[PDB]
Amino acid sequence: HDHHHDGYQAPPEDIALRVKALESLLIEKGLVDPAAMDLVVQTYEHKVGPRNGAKVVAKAWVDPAYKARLLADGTAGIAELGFSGVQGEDMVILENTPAVHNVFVCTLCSCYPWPTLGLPPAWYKAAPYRSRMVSDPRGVLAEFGLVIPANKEIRVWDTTAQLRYMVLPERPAGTEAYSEEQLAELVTRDSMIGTGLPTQP
């Protein structure tokens, strides 16, 4: 019962060698620049991640004017906080309401809002989540410890085009006059994908 196709299975024993060989070849031909590649890695290891989206959500929670702007134009909205670029060029923000619960997926591959959430986790890119999310949202969500009220509508957004989606979670109850910073700590990656809820105080 090892992992096989859920994204966490073991890579081939020689994978590192194959990668090292291609890299050397590409550098040798002058197609890639090692120094520039290190900067790319650093950017997604240390600079771009869910903390970005968290700041976006937190700000929308406390600032109604910003929220309105964000929902009208996601790209400009997230830019106000200095977030933008690859895989986030055309953002659409999905507002969770008492009537609607949003969650997104890329059934066709792995499309995901890089600038605000960083690179996707292995499970988001794998068959189990992608295959089932569009047919049985509740079944999948239950595996994440999240049960949606039966009367509450679930909206699954499939990222088939060049639009990129991020979920604006509902603000947890009992968080009055919380600072933007304290509110941001409640916003998990899952809560912004739609596969979870913000932490409750």
Added chain:
Amino acid sequence: MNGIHDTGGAHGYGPVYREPNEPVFRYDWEKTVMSLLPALLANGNFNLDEFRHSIERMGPAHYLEGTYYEHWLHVFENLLVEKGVLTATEVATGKAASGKTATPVLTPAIVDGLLSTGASAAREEGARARFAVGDKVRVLNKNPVGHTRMPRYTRGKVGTVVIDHGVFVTPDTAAHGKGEHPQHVYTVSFTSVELWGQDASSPKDTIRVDLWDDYLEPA
């Protein structure tokens, strides 16, 4: 392409296992593979649509067995040969054929600027929009062997246009050197019942999919 990659609605893939406290990169080789993508895209060695379709064209078993970044590694070893940037020999030997004959476009000086800017697929002008939000539409039954973005589970199904996102590049043509053919992209809403049938559905649930203008027809 009706390939293994089109997973929407499939059974038998099992539970969604999720590693707790998962790192951005689980192995070092992943870092190399991941950082190669921007470097090669910047060179203009290939476009993102040809990239996706390269992955769609790997063996079904290899696609399932392979971890995510093996998918990418496959593209680099194969799509680069198809495009004639490398030879099968160069790619097999590991050793180049005539030395430093190109210059990397992605240099340290422009990394941040490039990553912060990206490349929108939105275009100024293209085909006129045939549909308005509220319109009932039916996804055309098409089965191209080439690259397409209308998921198999939507074909023939009827939905409601809920958003007109404006004009965008069409991947179907961009992936096969037939130009961008810009046209409108809509978000279409389908009911759970419409997609999966009376039994496998929930009354409140809906699925939204982004489809190009000529993917559709009036219901």
